[PDB]
């Protein structure tokens, strides 16, 4: 559902 950089 939405951005991160290793995870939710």
């Amino acid at each position, epitope marked *: 559902p939405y951005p*991160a*950089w*290793h*995870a*939710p």
Partner: antibody
Amino acid sequence: EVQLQQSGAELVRAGSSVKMSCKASGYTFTSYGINWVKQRPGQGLEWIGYINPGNGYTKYNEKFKGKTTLTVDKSSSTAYMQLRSLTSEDSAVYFCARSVYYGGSYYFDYWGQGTTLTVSS
Amino acid sequence: DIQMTQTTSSLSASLGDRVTISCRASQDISNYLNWYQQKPDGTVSLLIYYGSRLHSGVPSRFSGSGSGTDYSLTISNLEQEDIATYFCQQGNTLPRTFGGGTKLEIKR
């Protein structure tokens, strides 16, 4: 070496705000992310959020969002974190750290000395 | 999200022993675990990263392991210099979370 010199201790009144620095040195500032961790001297470390210097992208920890704002300036390799509507609960030492990629994730390989923030009148 | 429980707040040992600091994720982290060592003076530095195996230029006597929810930092042949607080951190999901940390002290 890689270095991160954070700001000097800060003294501010609840209701007010503050803006701390994290000046990077010895590496390409835009090739790595800056994370902010708070350590209230209670029980551990908290991940605030973080930012990609080149990207300008920011990802917050739901808790610290709304009152926190991460930014960066790259014509001087510095990153800033601004805290708003301060309260007793924001008295802590704040650290910034570099993020490196590995596997499919990150970890913090270098940190700053830290910035002490005392919210008081 | 995943929260880490370092389940011992203060750990007690003698210079020279094999110290083992643990850390448990409330869910599988596919070995996305890192270890930091904070000193009394306040400064923090990295030790071991990824699944707990990987070294960042440090004494060999620092070793990590673990596999699902259970991990550990093991300082064999302990040393003065090593008396500090150790925090584990999960890098599998957001938000990033650390454990309560474990502080070593000298046994008397």
